[PDB]
Amino acid sequence: TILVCASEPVTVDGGRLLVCRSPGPEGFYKVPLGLKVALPTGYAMLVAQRGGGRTTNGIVDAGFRGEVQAIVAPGRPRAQFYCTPLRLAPGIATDVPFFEVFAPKRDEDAGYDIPCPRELVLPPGGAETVTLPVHRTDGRHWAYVFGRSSLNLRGIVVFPTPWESGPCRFRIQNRGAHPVTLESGQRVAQLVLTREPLGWITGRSPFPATPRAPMQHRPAWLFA
Amino acid sequence: TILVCASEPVTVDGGRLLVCRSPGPEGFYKVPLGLKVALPTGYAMLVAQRGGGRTTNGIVDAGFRGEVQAIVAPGRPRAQFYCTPLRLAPGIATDVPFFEVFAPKRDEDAGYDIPCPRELVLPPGGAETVTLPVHRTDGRHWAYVFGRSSLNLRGIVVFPTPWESGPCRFRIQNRGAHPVTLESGQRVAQLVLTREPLGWITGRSPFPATPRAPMQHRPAWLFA
Ligand SMILES: O=c1ccn([C@H]2C[C@H](O)[C@@H](COP(=O)(O)O)O2)c(=O)[nH]1
Ligand SMILES: [Mg+2]
Numbered sequence: 416t417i418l419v420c421a422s423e424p425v426t427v428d429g430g431r432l433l434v435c436r437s438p439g440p441e442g443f444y445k446v447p448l449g450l451k452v453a454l455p456t457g458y459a460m461l462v463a464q465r466g467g468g469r470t471t472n473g474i475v476d477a478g479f480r481g482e483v484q485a486i487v488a489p490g491r492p493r494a495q496f497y498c499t500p501l502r503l504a505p506g507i508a509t510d511v512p513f514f515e516v517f518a519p520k521r522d523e524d525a526g527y528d529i530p531c532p533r534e535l536v537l538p539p540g541g542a543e544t545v546t547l548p549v550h551r552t553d554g555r556h557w558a559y560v561f562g563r564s565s566l567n568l569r570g571i572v573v574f575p576t577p578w579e580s581g582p583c584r585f586r587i588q589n590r591g592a593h594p595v596t597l598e599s600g601q602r603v604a605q606l607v608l609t610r611e612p613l614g615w616i617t618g619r620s621p622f623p624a625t626p627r628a629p630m631q632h633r634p635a636w637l638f639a
Numbered sequence: 640t641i642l643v644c645a646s647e648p649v650t651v652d653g654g655r656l657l658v659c660r661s662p663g664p665e666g667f668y669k670v671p672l673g674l675k676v677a678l679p680t681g682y683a684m685l686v687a688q689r690g691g692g693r694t695t696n697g698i699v700d701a702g703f704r705g706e707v708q709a710i711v712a713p714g715r716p717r718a719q720f721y722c723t724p725l726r727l728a729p730g731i732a733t734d735v736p737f738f739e740v741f742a743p744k745r746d747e748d749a750g751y752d753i754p755c756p757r758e759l760v761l762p763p764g765g766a767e768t769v770t771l772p773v774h775r776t777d778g779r780h781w782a783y784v785f786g787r788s789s790l791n792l793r794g795i796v797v798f799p800t801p802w803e804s805g806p807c808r809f810r811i812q813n814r815g816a817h818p819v820t821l822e823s824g825q826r827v828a829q830l831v832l833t834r835e836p837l838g839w840i841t842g843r844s845p846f847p848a849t850p851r852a853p854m855q856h857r858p859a860w861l862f863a
Contacts, residue, residue: 416861421651424650424651424652424653424657425650425651426648426649426650426651427645427648427649427650427651427862428648429648433648635861635862635863636861636862637640637859637860637861638651638859638860638861638862639857639859
């Protein structure tokens with residue numbers, strides 16, 4: 416059971432929260448969704464757009480008690496936003512010890528921060544493929560590289576990328592106005608482990624919309 | 640906590656449930672609203688339209704486990720429906736013993752049935768004022784005459800009416816095509832006692848909309 420305090424109308428739709436708001440065409444900036452959630456430990460929540468491509472995928476963790484915001488890129492002025500709770504997995508097997516690559520987190524936190532393995536100078540519009548020296552050794556849960564809120568707000572956009580085979584890889588693109596430098600060791604993304612796959616997440620696009628289909632392990636929402 | 644099992648999108652707005660459906664122009668008929676509720680004992684729920692003049696006010700009582708529906712008159716093809724939880728008051732102080740007028744109820748039921756004092760013959764379009772020989776002795780709680788869902792369906796429409804001072808009175812209108820005859824003793828409306836006012840209820844309208852303003856005591860909804 417997820418607790419939901421809401422200052423504005425919220426639609427519950429196929430297991431996920433749906434909010435209709437009309438941000439401006441500018442970006443990148445934070446679009447308040449009119450609700451707060453209290454996720455139980457072991458849950459996180461994906462925030463993304465319903466049927467459009469101007470929103471960074473966000474991750475709300477179980478310790479977050481502020482208003483939920485969508486962070487959007489420059490785009491068409493109206494938007495619908497989905498929130499999908501994610502049942503977290505404990506870990507995944509890796510050939511290298513897991514915490515020699517990813518940073519330790521709290522049980523309350525959703526994801527494991529990913530330090531940049533090398534300096535990166537992204538000119539405006541520039542993209543780079545970031546690759547980590549670690550492999551998965553089986554397929555018991557799922558794992559996903561997502562951006563970090565701080566970077567998404569700067570228009571430095573990690574492409575939400577699945578990780579089931581090969582090395583941990585993700586694309587990062589600077590949609591900002593100025594060139595950006597990511598220092599080696601800087602926390603540039605996060606790794607989320609899930610009990611159930613996020614089938615739509617492909618790694619090929621900056622702004623993957625969450626599809627309208629309902630989910631399989633739907634939790635309960637309490638509107639208080 | 641009220642428990643909602645929703646097979647369709649439901650909007651939580653300012654404490655009410657909001658549903659947008661596309662009923663046909665015809666009336667009278669039941670419009671399914673995509674949800675079932677398990678009200679706790681001592682709760683009812685008002686079903687009415689939000690911003691249109693087409694829908695009879697209904698009462699879902701605590702025992703009802705089927706699909707919540709709205710019973711609409713003939714009219715416009717588009718419609719939004721509010722569901723307003725109602726905290727029942729246990730009784731009201733009256734000048735004559737309550738149960739000499741109002742029929743007794745179960746605790747799972749929401750309203751106390753109102754037997755028609757005399758016979759009414761209602762030509763199509765014709766309304767009448769029923770008056771019951773009982774007065775209130777204090778404003779302890781609120782009291783409202785609503786319709787009964789069986790008569791709403793037949794176009795025989797009780798005007799939702801408040802009962803603060805004077806005698807229990809209510810108007811009842813036959814918006815059907817054919818004359819109707821209400822028999823003496825027949826159960827022709829229902830009386831509903833509430834801890835909080837339904838401030839917009841006037842008695843002078845067949846299809847009062849429920850206004851958009853959020854309620855005083857938002858209850859907890861649990862989607863499951
Ligand atoms: O379309 C309808 C018709 C009837 N009921 C009912 C059966 C109960 O009579 C009713 C609540 O009114 P009371 O019985 O408490 O008065 O819930 C509904 O929920 N939806
Ligand atoms: Mg009824």
